[PDB]
Homo-oligomer: A and B are copies of this chain.
Amino acid sequence: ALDHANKANSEAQKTIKKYQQQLKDVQTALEEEQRARDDAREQLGISE
C-alpha cells in the first residue's frame, strides 16, 4: 500500500514541477506582450 502510495506522490509531485515551468514562460509571454502594447500605443503617438 505504501509503495503504491509513495510512488503515486512522486508521480503527483512530478506534475507540480511540470506546471510551474509552464507558468514561468507564460509570465514571460506576458512580459513580451505587455511591453508589446507599450510601443504599439507609442507607435500611435507617432502616427497620430
**Chain multiplicity (copies):** 2
Residues in chain B near residue A5, CB distance under 8 A: 2, 5-6, 9
Given contacts A15-B16, A16-B16, A47-B47, 4 further A-B contacts (CB under 8 A): A1-B2, A5-B5, A5-B6, A40-B41
Where the two chains meet, the residues of A that have a C-beta atom closer than 8 Å to any C-beta of B are 1-2, 5-6, 8-9, 12-13, 15-16, 19-20, 22-23, 26-27, 29-30, 33-34, 36-37, 40-41, 43-44, 47-48
Residues in chain B near residue A6, CB distance under 8 A: 5
**Chain B nearest Cβ from A6, distance in angstroms:** 6
Cross-chain contact A37 with B26 (CB below 8 angstroms): no
